[PDB]
Design a binder for this molecule. Sequence first.
Ligand code: GSM
Ligand code: ZN
Length: 400
Amino acid sequence: HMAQRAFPNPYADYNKSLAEGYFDAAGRLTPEFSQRLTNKIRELLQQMERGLKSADPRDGTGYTGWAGIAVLYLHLYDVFGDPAYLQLAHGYVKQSLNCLTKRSITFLCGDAGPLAVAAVLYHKMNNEKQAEDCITRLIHLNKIDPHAPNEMLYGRIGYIYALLFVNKNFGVEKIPQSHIQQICETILTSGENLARKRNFTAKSPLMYEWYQEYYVGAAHGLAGIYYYLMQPSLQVSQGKLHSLVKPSVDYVCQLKFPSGNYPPCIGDNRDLLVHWCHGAPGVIYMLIQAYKVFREEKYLCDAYQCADVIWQYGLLKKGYGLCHGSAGNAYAFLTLYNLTQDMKYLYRACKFAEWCLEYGEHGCRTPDTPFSLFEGMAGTIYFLADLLVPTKARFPAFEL
Ligand SMILES: CSC[C@H](NC(=O)CC[C@H](N)C(=O)O)C(=O)NCC(=O)O
Ligand SMILES: [Zn+2]
């Protein structure tokens, strides 16, 4: 039923001849293709700026609101170096800081997004007082919601991302590692406890849930949590990596549909969603990181299968967005490219970019927030700009 959710892929798969128009033998984009990306970015930015005039004033979040637009502009500033982009980011940061709701802790859906993005913007504008004030507030946020879930949009790893985002952008340990360590400990303890209570232990030493479901994917589920627990940034011990995380990863691997896709929740029989939030485009990160950490070929094999599912069924009728759209799906190819150095996957990303360059010409659904980072145009623009330098590309607000 995946076919019903996708457009047929109109593109030929990789060969040397077809790839030459997009990038050279070193994987560096051609000037021509680079400029075509740049031209579309400028075109879409105009539409986005106009569209955001109608966006909800109250939503300051990374996922659907102002801080996510600031994330885009910070990225464009880094890519292009145009000071006007940094100024745009400032405007959006200011809007976002007037929208704190005190209800959530995450980068994507909570107050950590505005605060972490603001800290970085202020730093980039040489505003030490405001940068430091934002960091203080961000650190303190780790109190307003204990017994949170563990997942990306509403839970502990979503807060961890905000901390990592500051540290990466300052290039120094602005948030002490000990802060990250203690959250990591809570996550691991939570997983062991739930697995024990539900007698998963033998097959899966860790287990997590959100909204009373065992979500499997990146946004709300196991694949996102395990991707994080396997990151050197989180400093999980070798002992816990092998005894707790690896067998829990293997359990997720075992949930794979015959197609190579993954169910949204444990026990789901319908093979339908090919999204970052649910399915192969989000689970692929766990597989790739598992390969990097454990070096077992099965993980790489599974990642290849993810890429094939996405190549076939990844041009979504849903639209061009990151959370569940063609641009988010294209990032799966970039992560596999960056692991393998196989230009086939850079090519696939470029062809998905070609699709996005025809934005609005396919009869896609209009997103609920048509201009947002995760549902809308800002995310598509983010992807196009990130593709300019493929080796540095990372799925925003998620990939490390
Ligand atoms: C965490 S996002 C989950 C996502 N939700 C949507 O696609 C809803 C539409 C969204 N609000 C938009 O406007 O893009 C989804 O997978 N929906 C289930 C489905 O497509 O059947
Ligand atoms: Zn989604």
